[PDB]
Amino acid sequence: EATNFSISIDDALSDPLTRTSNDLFPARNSITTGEVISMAASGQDYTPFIVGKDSRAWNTGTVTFYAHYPALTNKRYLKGGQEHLFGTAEAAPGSQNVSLKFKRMTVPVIILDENDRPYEGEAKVELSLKNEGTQDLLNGTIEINENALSENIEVKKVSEGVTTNVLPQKINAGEEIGTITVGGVTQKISAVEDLDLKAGSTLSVRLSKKFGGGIIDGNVPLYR
Amino acid sequence: TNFSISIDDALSDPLTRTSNDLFPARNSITTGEVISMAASGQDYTPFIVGKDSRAWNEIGTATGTVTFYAHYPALTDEAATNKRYLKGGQEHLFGTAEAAPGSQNVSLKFKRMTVPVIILDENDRPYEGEAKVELSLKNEGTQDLLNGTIEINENALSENIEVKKVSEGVTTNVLPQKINAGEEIGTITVGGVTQKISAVEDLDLKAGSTLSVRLSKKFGGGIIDGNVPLYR
Amino acid sequence: EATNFSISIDDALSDPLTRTSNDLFPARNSITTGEVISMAASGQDYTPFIVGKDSRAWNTGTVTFYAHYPALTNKRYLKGGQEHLFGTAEAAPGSQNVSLKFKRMTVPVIILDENDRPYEGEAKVELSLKNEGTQDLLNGTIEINENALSENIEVKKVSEGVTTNVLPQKINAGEEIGTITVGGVTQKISAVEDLDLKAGSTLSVRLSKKFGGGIIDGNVPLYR
Amino acid sequence: TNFSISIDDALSDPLTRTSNDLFPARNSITTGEVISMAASGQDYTPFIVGKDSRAWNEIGTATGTVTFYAHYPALTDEAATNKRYLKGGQEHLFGTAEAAPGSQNVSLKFKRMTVPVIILDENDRPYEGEAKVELSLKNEGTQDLLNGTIEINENALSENIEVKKVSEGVTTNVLPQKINAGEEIGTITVGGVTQKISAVEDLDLKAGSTLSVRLSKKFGGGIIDGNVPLYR
Ligand SMILES: [Cl-]
Ligand SMILES: [Cl-]
Ligand SMILES: [Zn+2]
Ligand SMILES: [Zn+2]
Ligand SMILES: [Zn+2]
Ligand SMILES: [Zn+2]
Ligand SMILES: [Zn+2]
Ligand SMILES: [Zn+2]
Ligand SMILES: [Zn+2]
Ligand SMILES: [Zn+2]
Ligand SMILES: [Zn+2]
Ligand SMILES: [Zn+2]
Ligand SMILES: [Zn+2]
Ligand SMILES: [Zn+2]
Ligand SMILES: [Zn+2]
Ligand SMILES: [Zn+2]
Ligand SMILES: [Zn+2]
Ligand SMILES: [Zn+2]
Ligand SMILES: [Zn+2]
Ligand SMILES: [Zn+2]
């Protein structure tokens, strides 16, 4: 039975069959020592907490904690670009450590070359999506403003040291949301399938000449 | 004493699209077309559709109900008498019927054993331009003469097959085979300029399947896809 | 060049690879001779028209027609149950016949047995879905009231002579929307996959004991 | 002069789940475990992981870069010297490495060639109850000793295989094969009462695949599915 407790950054449990954005980008890698989170025990205002440095006083049975990363500056207005994470924990008072299981509420975007390797090159990759929404401060959920206009968002490469995150929204199959510009020449990049993006989702931009003229599709029925 | 034949289509689930929907068997096997037909345990003999009538004695050692089997187009004299080698291009249909001796009409339910290929524009409408569309697929296989099933020669090399437009009035049929996701099987040539057309997903083609080539500039620089995992 | 024109009931062009509810239930079978539709040429109020009986006076170049089936009694409030169809045509004045291409704006529900044959039996099949929405009178589109509560809708068999139609809405994978009652014993029927239902969509209820204990699922990756 | 071995996992696309994610090769091939390892064009010889070191002479006729191949569990003395027959249950891993002679460490990238089976409750959490879960699948195949690939015997009959829970500390592995949609392959028995567990979709299982058995009462009376066609 400890007086104060420390915080550790863990990930929410992923789909056994599908990779989550937490599988691709652990919460530990974003929320490192010295990073500030907004934390609260159920029914308390969010207060800043410095990860790997701060401790909090244990002042029944089990306590539920809630955390936002980055720290907060009810619901709030939000924009895309910077990732937004929401964590929860259930701990017993007196525990030395409290493990927050984070979930990424925004959607990271990765650029891959033809061989699924991370793209490094001079081409500019942009997406035209809704970039304004509302976040629920109690459960972390982001919902796009349906009245919002689609905006051009540039997608960053791994060498840029920041991952472009978009707000959760539905992308329709064949929706021409993307563009690739290389030497003042633009080409379209579209979704092949319907993507109803949510917390834990990842978006991949796959560059190639494989579908230059169009696509091959088909059905596989079964006769009786 | 004798029975007539009617050309019908084999069923699938009520919600599933079959190539029969787009290309009904009755549109291929018209009056004057010849099929190889046999009763179970008997040899395939020619039958002229919309003209011939068959005697109810030609049923083998069947009693109560007779099962008929038919190939379209008709077989060679050697194949009419287990398996045969086949190539792509021309469609191959296999039909079955269950009838009681004495019935005036016998409805043959045809399955399409090959896979038709349709060229569509960006809006799913039949492409009508002057661009050349080709596919690089395996074009040799074996057909089971008793159930109509075609299985590709895995040792076969992929060959270039030109795809006909809807207006050409003949549908390019390919043999059932697996096409892998991202497999660069297609090409579109227009004014000595070629572009690639690839599969977006795995397609394990079988009888009743249809293949669509959907031309557009939508994926000039690549594709957007992603994961939507569920938190159960 | 004709003075008056007759109307013919056709279907909107379907997805070459997927069966539409028009493929399952042609518009011709619903809108038979003697059935009344609300029709208008672009920029005119909808007026009743008796199919296979009425004719209309041709009083530039091409005319666009719009039609609702059943007839109307801007936007309007709608409920599930009875199917709702919306048709359009582009015709040249003087044409003897005008072919309306209809699209089903509601979603039919079919009950199938284990062998995909139409279910005839004594079991009661119900769905718990939103049953109130709004229809666009200019394009036929139905959008569910998000504030609406889910209601129990009984699903009809083919012998009942009426097809249960639901309003377009998203059904999530594993959503326990269905129930089957046979001899005062109820069982759950859930969606296996995400279904973002729209005009042209069909819903199938497949009864069996195949998934009594649960389901088998898996992934098929590809190593580099 | 000598090199050590490290157990790593083979890669797939950054967005795809492999069985390696859930079951890392390093958790199976621990210190003291024996693997059959060979340099290209040479015989498989045993190697004790976390203990042995191999001489840089055992590389065949390679120069510049050497390719290594490894089997886990280790092969029989006859298989160490083209193909072998295999059964389900115990997992089978195949690793490769490309190294330059003189390197102090060689990292073997293991692929899982068999398919692990996990039992989950309604919420994707590992099932911990007393119910018996069985699958009826083909349990005999052939493995390629040069690339690790397992291909099922199509002539094989389906056999009942009991599935172990996560707590049992041994994972039931099945051989790669196609499972058809609606195929009633599974059974759950609890208190002498059996229920069926079937596949909802076609699963053409291969190396790196995982199979999940998700128990619930959600589909007691059947399933809701449907079509959402697009009007392009
Ligand atoms: Cl059918
Ligand atoms: Cl990987
Ligand atoms: Zn963790
Ligand atoms: Zn932000
Ligand atoms: Zn790839
Ligand atoms: Zn390429
Ligand atoms: Zn598809
Ligand atoms: Zn032929
Ligand atoms: Zn050839
Ligand atoms: Zn376009
Ligand atoms: Zn995909
Ligand atoms: Zn029509
Ligand atoms: Zn109504
Ligand atoms: Zn079925
Ligand atoms: Zn059954
Ligand atoms: Zn799945
Ligand atoms: Zn074994
Ligand atoms: Zn056996
Ligand atoms: Zn439940
Ligand atoms: Zn399905």
Side-chain angles (χ1 to χ4, degrees), chain A residues 2-73 75-78 80-224, chain B residues 1-75 79-81 83-86 88-124 126-232, chain C residues 2-73 75-78 80-224, chain D residues 1-75 79-81 83-86 88-124 126-232:
Chain A
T3 304
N4 291 35
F5 63 89
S6 65
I7 290 287
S8 80
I9 310 304
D10 197 348
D11 298 288
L13 302 172
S14 299
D15 196 329
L17 303 178
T18 312
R19 264 195 188 173
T20 65
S21 70
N22 289 84
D23 292 330
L24 267 86
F25 311 101
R28 261 177 283 106
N29 300 354
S30 291
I31 325 164
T32 57
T33 305
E35 295 308 289
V36 179
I37 59 151
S38 297
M39 188 179 67
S42 41
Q44 292 189 324
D45 283 310
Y46 288 105
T47 50
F49 184 105
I50 301 150
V51 177
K53 305 241 192 82
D54 277 0
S55 59
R56 269 195 193 169
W58 265 117
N59 329 303
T60 192
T62 68
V63 187
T64 307
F65 296 95
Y66 301 96
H68 290 268
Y69 182 75
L72 307 171
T73 306
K75 283 175 165 247
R76 66 163 174 172
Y77 158 97
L78 229 55
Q82 167 62 233
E83 68 180 347
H84 287 283
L85 292 97
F86 185 75
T88 68
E90 271 180 14
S95 301
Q96 292 200 303
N97 190 256
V98 168
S99 197
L100 286 164
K101 320 286 177 200
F102 280 88
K103 200 194 267 197
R104 192 169 281 99
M105 308 316 290
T106 50
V107 181
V109 188
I110 60 162
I111 317 166
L112 303 162
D113 68 17
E114 205 174 317
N115 301 300
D116 307 313
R117 280 151 157 266
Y119 176 83
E120 288 304 337
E122 294 294 275
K124 183 162 86 177
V125 186
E126 298 176 291
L127 299 175
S128 175
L129 294 170
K130 290 164 200 304
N131 193 54
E132 61 174 288
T134 300
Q135 187 181 35
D136 190 290
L137 296 175
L138 277 52
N139 68 32
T141 294
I142 305 164
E143 270 156 30
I144 210 86
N145 180 8
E146 293 299 323
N147 302 290
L149 297 173
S150 295
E151 309 189 331
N152 261 274
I153 306 135
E154 201 188 339
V155 183
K156 307 228 174 201
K157 295 179 286 157
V158 163
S159 61
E160 291 184 60
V162 185
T163 309
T164 299
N165 275 236
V166 295
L167 303 176
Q169 57 199 278
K170 173 115 185 281
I171 299 165
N172 304 312
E175 202 172 351
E176 314 177 8
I177 58 148
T179 52
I180 178 154
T181 307
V182 58
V185 178
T186 71
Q187 288 220 88
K188 295 169 169 182
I189 308 162
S190 308
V192 286
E193 58 200 357
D194 272 18
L195 299 155
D196 195 9
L197 305 166
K198 302 284 184 222
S201 297
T202 318
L203 209 58
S204 60
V205 177
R206 299 167 182 275
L207 314 172
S208 71
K209 289 172 190 171
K210 277 177 186 293
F211 308 99
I215 66 167
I216 287 139
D217 195 10
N219 52 36
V220 186
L222 184 65
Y223 288 116
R224 278 208 181 108
Chain B
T1 301
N2 291 34
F3 63 89
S4 66
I5 289 287
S6 81
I7 309 304
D8 283 338
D9 296 288
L11 304 166
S12 184
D13 178 86
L15 268 74
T16 91
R17 168 73 78 227
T18 63
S19 72
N20 297 79
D21 294 337
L22 307 167
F23 302 108
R26 70 186 103 88
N27 286 12
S28 293
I29 325 165
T30 57
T31 305
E33 295 308 290
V34 179
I35 60 151
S36 297
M37 188 177 65
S40 151
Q42 299 298 120
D43 298 302
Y44 288 106
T45 50
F47 186 103
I48 301 146
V49 177
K51 305 241 193 282
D52 278 1
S53 58
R54 189 159 287 191
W56 267 116
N57 26 274
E58 302 167 56
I59 59 163
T61 54
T63 194
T65 69
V66 187
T67 307
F68 297 95
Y69 300 97
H71 289 269
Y72 183 75
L75 307 170
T81 57
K83 284 177 166 74
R84 67 163 174 172
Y85 304 107
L86 231 55
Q90 167 62 234
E91 69 183 343
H92 287 284
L93 331 170
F94 184 75
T96 69
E98 271 180 16
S103 301
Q104 190 51 81
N105 190 257
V106 168
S107 308
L108 286 165
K109 310 281 202 81
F110 281 89
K111 295 177 179 170
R112 183 167 284 105
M113 315 311 295
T114 50
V115 180
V117 188
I118 61 168
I119 316 165
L120 313 159
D121 67 17
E122 206 175 315
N123 302 301
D124 279 341
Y127 177 68
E128 294 173 322
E130 293 297 275
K132 183 162 86 178
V133 186
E134 299 176 290
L135 297 176
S136 173
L137 293 171
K138 292 165 199 304
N139 193 55
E140 281 86 32
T142 299
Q143 187 182 36
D144 190 290
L145 297 175
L146 279 46
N147 67 32
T149 295
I150 304 163
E151 165 60 42
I152 209 86
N153 180 9
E154 291 300 324
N155 302 291
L157 298 178
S158 296
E159 310 189 329
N160 262 273
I161 306 134
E162 201 187 338
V163 184
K164 305 229 173 199
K165 291 182 296 174
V166 166
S167 63
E168 290 182 60
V170 185
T171 311
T172 298
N173 271 239
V174 293
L175 302 174
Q177 56 198 276
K178 173 117 184 282
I179 298 164
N180 304 313
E183 202 175 352
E184 311 177 13
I185 59 146
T187 50
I188 179 153
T189 308
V190 59
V193 178
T194 71
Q195 288 221 92
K196 294 168 168 183
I197 309 159
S198 309
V200 286
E201 202 54 68
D202 273 15
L203 300 156
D204 195 10
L205 306 165
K206 299 285 168 73
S209 281
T210 318
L211 208 54
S212 62
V213 176
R214 211 151 50 247
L215 317 170
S216 71
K217 302 182 176 189
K218 279 178 188 289
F219 316 98
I223 67 167
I224 287 141
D225 71 350
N227 294 357
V228 185
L230 318 177
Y231 285 89
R232 294 179 181 81
Chain C
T3 304
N4 291 35
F5 63 89
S6 65
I7 290 287
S8 80
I9 310 304
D10 197 348
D11 298 288
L13 302 172
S14 299
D15 196 329
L17 303 178
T18 312
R19 264 195 188 173
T20 65
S21 70
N22 289 84
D23 292 330
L24 267 86
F25 311 101
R28 261 177 283 106
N29 300 354
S30 291
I31 325 164
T32 57
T33 305
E35 295 308 289
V36 179
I37 59 151
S38 297
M39 188 179 67
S42 41
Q44 292 189 324
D45 283 310
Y46 288 105
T47 50
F49 184 105
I50 301 150
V51 177
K53 305 241 192 82
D54 277 0
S55 59
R56 269 195 193 169
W58 265 117
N59 329 303
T60 192
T62 68
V63 187
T64 307
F65 296 95
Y66 301 96
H68 290 268
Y69 182 75
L72 307 171
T73 306
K75 283 175 165 247
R76 66 163 174 172
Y77 158 97
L78 229 55
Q82 167 62 233
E83 68 180 347
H84 287 283
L85 292 97
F86 185 75
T88 68
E90 271 180 14
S95 301
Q96 292 200 303
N97 190 256
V98 168
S99 197
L100 286 164
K101 320 286 177 200
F102 280 88
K103 200 194 267 197
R104 192 169 281 99
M105 308 316 290
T106 50
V107 181
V109 188
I110 60 162
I111 317 166
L112 303 162
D113 68 17
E114 205 174 317
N115 301 300
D116 307 313
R117 280 151 157 266
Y119 176 83
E120 288 304 337
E122 294 294 275
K124 183 162 86 177
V125 186
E126 298 176 291
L127 299 175
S128 175
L129 294 170
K130 290 164 200 304
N131 193 54
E132 61 174 288
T134 300
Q135 187 181 35
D136 190 290
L137 296 175
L138 277 52
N139 68 32
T141 294
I142 305 164
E143 270 156 30
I144 210 86
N145 180 8
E146 293 299 323
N147 302 290
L149 297 173
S150 295
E151 309 189 331
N152 261 274
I153 306 135
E154 201 188 339
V155 183
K156 307 228 174 201
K157 295 179 286 157
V158 163
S159 61
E160 291 184 60
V162 185
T163 309
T164 299
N165 275 236
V166 295
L167 303 176
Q169 57 199 278
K170 173 115 185 281
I171 299 165
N172 304 312
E175 202 172 351
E176 314 177 8
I177 58 148
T179 52
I180 178 154
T181 307
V182 58
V185 178
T186 71
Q187 288 220 88
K188 295 169 169 182
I189 308 162
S190 308
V192 286
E193 58 200 357
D194 272 18
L195 299 155
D196 195 9
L197 305 166
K198 302 284 184 222
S201 297
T202 318
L203 209 58
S204 60
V205 177
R206 299 167 182 275
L207 314 172
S208 71
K209 289 172 190 171
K210 277 177 186 293
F211 308 99
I215 66 167
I216 287 139
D217 195 10
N219 52 36
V220 186
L222 184 65
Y223 288 116
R224 278 208 181 108
Chain D
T1 301
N2 291 34
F3 63 89
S4 66
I5 289 287
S6 81
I7 309 304
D8 283 338
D9 296 288
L11 304 166
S12 184
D13 178 86
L15 268 74
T16 91
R17 168 73 78 227
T18 63
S19 72
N20 297 79
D21 294 337
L22 307 167
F23 302 108
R26 70 186 103 88
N27 286 12
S28 293
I29 325 165
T30 57
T31 305
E33 295 308 290
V34 179
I35 60 151
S36 297
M37 188 177 65
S40 151
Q42 299 298 120
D43 298 302
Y44 288 106
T45 50
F47 186 103
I48 301 146
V49 177
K51 305 241 193 282
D52 278 1
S53 58
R54 189 159 287 191
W56 267 116
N57 26 274
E58 302 167 56
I59 59 163
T61 54
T63 194
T65 69
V66 187
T67 307
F68 297 95
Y69 300 97
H71 289 269
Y72 183 75
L75 307 170
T81 57
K83 284 177 166 74
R84 67 163 174 172
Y85 304 107
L86 231 55
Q90 167 62 234
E91 69 183 343
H92 287 284
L93 331 170
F94 184 75
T96 69
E98 271 180 16
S103 301
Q104 190 51 81
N105 190 257
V106 168
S107 308
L108 286 165
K109 310 281 202 81
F110 281 89
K111 295 177 179 170
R112 183 167 284 105
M113 315 311 295
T114 50
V115 180
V117 188
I118 61 168
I119 316 165
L120 313 159
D121 67 17
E122 206 175 315
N123 302 301
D124 279 341
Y127 177 68
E128 294 173 322
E130 293 297 275
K132 183 162 86 178
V133 186
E134 299 176 290
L135 297 176
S136 173
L137 293 171
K138 292 165 199 304
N139 193 55
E140 281 86 32
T142 299
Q143 187 182 36
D144 190 290
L145 297 175
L146 279 46
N147 67 32
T149 295
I150 304 163
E151 165 60 42
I152 209 86
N153 180 9
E154 291 300 324
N155 302 291
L157 298 178
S158 296
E159 310 189 329
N160 262 273
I161 306 134
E162 201 187 338
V163 184
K164 305 229 173 199
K165 291 182 296 174
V166 166
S167 63
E168 290 182 60
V170 185
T171 311
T172 298
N173 271 239
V174 293
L175 302 174
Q177 56 198 276
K178 173 117 184 282
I179 298 164
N180 304 313
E183 202 175 352
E184 311 177 13
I185 59 146
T187 50
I188 179 153
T189 308
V190 59
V193 178
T194 71
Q195 288 221 92
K196 294 168 168 183
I197 309 159
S198 309
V200 286
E201 202 54 68
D202 273 15
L203 300 156
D204 195 10
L205 306 165
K206 299 285 168 73
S209 281
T210 318
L211 208 54
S212 62
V213 176
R214 211 151 50 247
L215 317 170
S216 71
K217 302 182 176 189
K218 279 178 188 289
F219 316 98
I223 67 167
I224 287 141
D225 71 350
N227 294 357
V228 185
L230 318 177
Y231 285 89
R232 294 179 181 81

